[PDB]
Amino acid sequence: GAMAPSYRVKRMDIAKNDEECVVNAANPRGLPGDGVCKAVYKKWPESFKNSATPVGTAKTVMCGTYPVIHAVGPNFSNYTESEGDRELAAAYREVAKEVTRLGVNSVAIPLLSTGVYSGGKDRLTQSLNHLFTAMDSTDADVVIYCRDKEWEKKISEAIQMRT
Ligand SMILES: Nc1cc(Br)ccn1
Ligand SMILES: [Cl-]
Ligand SMILES: [Cl-]
Numbered sequence: 001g002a003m004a005p006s007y008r009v010k011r012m013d014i015a016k017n018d019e020e021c022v023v024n025a026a027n028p029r030g031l032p033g034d035g036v037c038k039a040v041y042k043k044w045p046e047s048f049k050n051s052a053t054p055v056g057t058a059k060t061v062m063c064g065t066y067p068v069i070h071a072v073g074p075n076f077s078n079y080t081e082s083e084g085d086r087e088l089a090a091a092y093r094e095v096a097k098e099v100t101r102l103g104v105n106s107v108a109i110p111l112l113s114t115g116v117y118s119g120g121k122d123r124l125t126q127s128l129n130h131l132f133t134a135m136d137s138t139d140a141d142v143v144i145y146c147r148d149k150e151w152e153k154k155i156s157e158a159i160q161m162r163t
């Protein structure tokens with residue numbers, strides 16, 4: 001565990017993270033995909049061996065000894081708001097199980113279902129709150145990666161508001 005488990009946010013490529021493992025915003029078929037998934041494929045291509053896993057689940061594959069936790073958030077184009085909400089919460093619970101099982105002291109994590117799976121909606125708050133629900137009982141240092149300056153501000157504010 002981390003000595004004083006924390007949340008942090010950084011605005012940069014999750015492929016350049018400084019943590020002991022990474023969560024991929026994966027697709028169910030283990031394809032190279034777009035956005036976070038394509039950056040992860042470029043950095044850790046070996047981790048996409050048998051990475052396919054259903055919506056609402058996480059599957060870890062090692063790239064050398066570095067764990068890549070493939071977390072499949074729902075595509076809100078396909079799911080109802082209600083079913084999508086349930087699957088998004090579930091993907092993060094499976095990430096918390098994997099992070100715990102791996103025994104890491106830190107994890108780099110994107111906001112699931114906020115990009116091309118958002119169904120063209122702003123899901124920062126919805127995705128972040130599910131992240132907190134899952135990860136709050138873990139003792140890993142959590143570092144959330146984003147690319148948008150205003151998202152960075154909002155995420156930082158949401159973290160600081162609970163400290
Ligand atoms: N490569 C990336 C892309 C996004 Br979106 C967030 C973090 N890292
Ligand atoms: Cl960068
Ligand atoms: Cl996404």
Ligand SMILES: [Cl-]
Nearest residue numbers: 146147148151
């Ligand atoms: Cl972002």
